[PDB]
Amino acid sequence: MSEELIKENMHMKLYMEGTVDNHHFKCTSEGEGKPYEGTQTMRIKVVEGGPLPFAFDILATSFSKTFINHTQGIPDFFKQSFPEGFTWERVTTYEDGGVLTATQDTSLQDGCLIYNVKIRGVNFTSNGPVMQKKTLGWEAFTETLYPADGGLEGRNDMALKLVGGSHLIANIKTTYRSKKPAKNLKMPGVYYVDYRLERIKEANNETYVEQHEVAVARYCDLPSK
Ligand SMILES: [Cl-]
DSSP: OOOTTSOSSEEEEEEEEEEETTEEEEEEEEEEEETTTTEEEEEEEEEESOSOSSOTHHHHTTOOGGGOEEOTTOOOTTGGGTTTOEEEEEEEEETTSOEEEEEEEEEEETTEEEEEEEEEEEOOOTTSTTTTTOEEEEOOEEEEEEEETTEEEEEEEEEEEETTSOEEEEEEEEEEEESSOGGGOOOOOSEEEEEEEEEEEEETTTTEEEEEEEEEEEOOOSOOO
């Protein structure tokens, strides 16, 4: 491919810290996946602030765009960015008021993918399902990506499962920026990424979490005209 530095099997290391409401936390994680098959596993330790007084679910989407299977010859903005790497900035707005901003740096060091994530969430109400930890993982979802603001932008709603069977919806806005100059990049048009983010295991009040993701990029295959 274009992306020779990105192998069929890749390891990753992640550093995460920040705050939700008045609550500081810090996590580390390590994992591996298959970047061209669109699959990955992450093993996460909460190392400061644990056990967290909020649903770990609100952090889950912040643990990896190199591991998307780009089908149908869709140009791969993330894989093309290496060795330089890329960043993202995101805001997630929960329909019951919580707002979580996240920024991430993605680099490649000696064959390993290194993530640095900073999180700041505010206005999660004490009585809500997040702060009361009444959440049960996300439904499968699809990101829409399109070229904008000198990079890629992403958009999508997501549905958080709650105990009792109902859902809490969040709307997500992301901006992705390559550290490689845009003249060295084959830019995609509008495309879609199908996601399934699943919790595999949790130990000690969500102090240890294993997470799995499958991600497949595609066009819309509906008949046209
Ligand atoms: Cl959507």
